Amino acid sequence: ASATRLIQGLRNWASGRDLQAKLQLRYQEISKRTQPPPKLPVGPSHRLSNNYYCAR
Amino acid sequence: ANVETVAVSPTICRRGGAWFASFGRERNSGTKLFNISGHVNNPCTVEEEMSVPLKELIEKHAGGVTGGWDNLLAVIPGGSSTPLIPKSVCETVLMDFDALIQAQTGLGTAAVIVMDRSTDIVKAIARLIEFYKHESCGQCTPCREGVDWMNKVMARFVRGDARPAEIDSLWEISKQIEGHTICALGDGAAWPVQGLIRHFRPELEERMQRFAQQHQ
Ligand code: SF4
Numbered sequence A: 001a002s003a004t005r006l007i008q009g010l011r012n013w014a015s016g017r018d019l020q021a022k023l024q025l026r027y028q029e030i031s032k033r034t035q036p037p038p039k040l041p042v043g044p045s046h047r048l049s050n051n052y053y054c055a056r
Numbered sequence B: 001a002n003v004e005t006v007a008v009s010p011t012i013c014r015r016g017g018a019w020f021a022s023f024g025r026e027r028n029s030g031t032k033l034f035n036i037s038g039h040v041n042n043p044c045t046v047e048e049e050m051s052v053p054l055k056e057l058i059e060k061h062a063g064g065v066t067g068g069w070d071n072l073l074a075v076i077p078g079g080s081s082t083p084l085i086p087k088s089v090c091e092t093v094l095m096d097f098d099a100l101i102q103a104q105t106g107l108g109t110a111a112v113i114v115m116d117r118s119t120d121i122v123k124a125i126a127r128l129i130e131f132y133k134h135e136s137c138g139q140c141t142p143c144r145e146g147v148d149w150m151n152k153v154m155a156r157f158v159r160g161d162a163r164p165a166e167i168d169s170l171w172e173i174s175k176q177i178e179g180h181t182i183c184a185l186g187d188g189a190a191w192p193v194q195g196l197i198r199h200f201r202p203e204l205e206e207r208m209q210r211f212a213q214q215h216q
Helices: A005-014 B003-014 B054-059 B097-102 B121-134 B141-158 B164-177 B185-199 B201-215
Strands: B031-036 B044-049 B072-076 B113-116
Touching: B003 B031, B031 B054, B031 B113, B121 B141, B121 B185, B121 B201, B141 B164, B141 B185, B141 B201, B164 B185, B164 B201, B185 B201
Parallel strands: none
Antiparallel strands: B031 B044, B072 B113
């Protein structure tokens, strides 16, 4: 984006897709880096008093 | 041979044939010492029949329970190698080997002691596990390592420093120690922990809830 109106209109006319809304230059919806630190869950193991390895 | 069996052995011969089995039931029979210590009025030792009701044993020979009969919390027969008996079970059950096995507690030797409602039974049983840690050899890896874990876990349950998966894991280790040792001290270290988890589950839940509500 951040282009003037005339070349925008000629881009829209030379290819009739209304090209401005989706143009594949990523500006603001890049994922914000340095996310908060994650806590990862533990699935169907680690439960005490059933985890005999002879079962699974 | 034990000193009771040796000491009864001359009177069996010099007195009548099978007169000794005129006392009680048929299989488990005769006379036995009963040693009533703990929270009873005037704790002592007596001789009685093998078959005898527990309430008559406690009241009618050694004073009474301090504060009436209703004040008692639990009664351990046998001593330290026997799980505990709550009050509703010991309203009826007599003092025989097969009857206490039907109550799922192996009768030891005569140490029929009580503990009061106003006493931390978790603290008493944790000190009993500290007794087993002080007096046990270390041939077998199971009783050595298991008495280590059970003492640390019972200390943490006196302080209430865990979550109920830990008390279930205490049930798991007390299953795994029993029946895999040389001697009966490992099995004897596994039984009272089992009896505590069988009978006084919600008091442990209350202790750990109190510590959670205070630490949070
Ligand atoms: S189970 Fe018995 S024989 Fe084995 S190490 Fe423990 S006290 Fe010693």
